[model samples]
Target: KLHKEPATLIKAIDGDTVKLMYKGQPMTFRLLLVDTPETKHPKKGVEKYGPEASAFTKKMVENAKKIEVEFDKGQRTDKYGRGLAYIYADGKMVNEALVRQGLAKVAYVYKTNNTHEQHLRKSEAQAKKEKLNIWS
Candidate 1:
């Protein structure tokens, strides 16, 4: 059964991830179907606009009064057991917003059942066309 989980946005870690508190539990969630450059990744040097992406996400999510988590069949926890969730704010999917703003790239990690795949693809193409975050 799909249940609506309400949460409070504590912070946004980056373009692709956020930290929230739900039912008194702290959770870190990644926006499905999109990936962002590692702004503070220990390895893999930071990419152009990595910080910008983080900033964008922060602006969108920081101090949000309430957020919603919609689960998918593949929304299983990651290897580290973090609840992999797609976030929604004010009825808008945060992942889609990130893609639309050219702050993230579609990430196909699962077995391709992600509903937002097409949207991410389109967003990426648009970003590339507009040179949103791509440096080259």
Candidate 2:
């Protein structure tokens, strides 16, 4: 079964980290691309928009359900052994949504198979133009 249904997000660790409830099991996802500044870097107090970014992520997951996982259908796991999957909420690509909204960056490491690389690039570019975080 494709399991194309919405699922509730149990927690949002940061802008790029989240835990989802699926099939009665908790699944953790580390947003593939973009690495935001460290919020607790001993040397640096907080990264730019770290809180805002995390807040944006929280908004996407609050009280959501029927979540679905869109697998790459190939190479299910990345180098770190993390499952490379696209998350959808009511048919919305959560990954793309985050990147598009400037909450996350496009992780282009898997350029050959990363379908959203281009879209992510565009999103980041726009974020930069607007001085979201990385640009400033």
Candidate 2 lDDT tens digits, 6-67: 44678777766678765577877655555544565559887777787777666766645556
Clashes of each: 0, 9
| Residue-level lDDT for 121 in candidate 2 | 83
For residues 2-116, write the lDDT of model 1, one tens digit per residue: 4558988877887777878877998887776778777877687777778988887787776455689876677467776566767887777777777777778778787634766
**Candidate 2 residue 44 C-alpha distance from true site, Å:** 5.8
lDDT of prediction 1? 0.74
After superposing candidate 1, which stretches have Cα over 4 Å from the reference?
A: 1-4
User: Per-prediction TM-score, please?
Assistant: 0.85, 0.70
What local lDDT does model 1 show for residue 24? 95
Candidate 2, residue 93: Cα displacement in angstroms equals: 2.9
State the C-alpha lDDT per candidate: 0.74, 0.64
Clashes of 2: 9
Q: Which ten residues in a row have the lowest lDDT in candidate 2?
A: 1-10
